[PDB]
Write a protein that binds this ligand. Sequence first.
Ligand SMILES: [Cl-]
Ligand SMILES: [Cl-]
Ligand SMILES: [Cl-]
Ligand SMILES: [Cl-]
Ligand SMILES: [Cl-]
Ligand SMILES: [Cu+2]
Length: 235
Amino acid sequence: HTLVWGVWVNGVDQGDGRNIYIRSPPNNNPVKNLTSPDMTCNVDNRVVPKSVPVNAGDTLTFEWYHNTRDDDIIASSHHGPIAVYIAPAASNGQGNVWVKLFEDAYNVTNSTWAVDRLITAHGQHSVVVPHVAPGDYLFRAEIIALHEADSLYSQNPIRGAQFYISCAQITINSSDDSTPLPAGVPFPGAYTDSTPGIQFNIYTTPATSYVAPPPSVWSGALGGSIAQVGDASLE
Ligand SMILES: [Cl-]
Ligand SMILES: [Cl-]
Ligand SMILES: [Cl-]
Ligand SMILES: [Cl-]
Ligand SMILES: [Cl-]
Ligand SMILES: [Cu+2]
């Protein structure tokens, strides 16, 4: 159970974005139905009044929280991967538009899931803004909590993978457009019951075996991190 508070741009807090530049849902409950329209941008997908200005090459940091800013972020039980996707805003997230910019899943090197790292990072994870066309975009940050994912939601709706989805409105101002954005995948649609990484037993299946759901990270993506970029208590 987690939500996006706001974003940082090059280590500068853009302030509370909830219902402002984040298409915030009403609460922190997961999406679970893989065919749901709610897979696009969560349960209240609508235009919000502000879009955060960035330039290509900026570090854009999403900041998550549980109940209040800079709290426990997400329950530690919620082990799973983190991904970020981009789509042109005019799409409203519809059709074959979502391009993956970032994936972290299980990290053998230090025996962490992405979610574990997110908690350590005070809810903060980042992407480099890609060299796409100037204009308005949706950045879709997605946490998959796997603690109940040994069952399919379609078999038992009390369980299943849990999707914490947040769409931020981002305006890319300066960009040389050296990596034009291609068509992408649909949400809903890209994840199905058989997709790798949707049905997974963290209790009995080795985490080193986990494969995150496709699609693969786009060739144009410039990277990211899961790491604190600024101290929210420093304000
Ligand atoms: Cl839960
Ligand atoms: Cl950190
Ligand atoms: Cl099942
Ligand atoms: Cl990949
Ligand atoms: Cl490319
Ligand atoms: Cu939860």
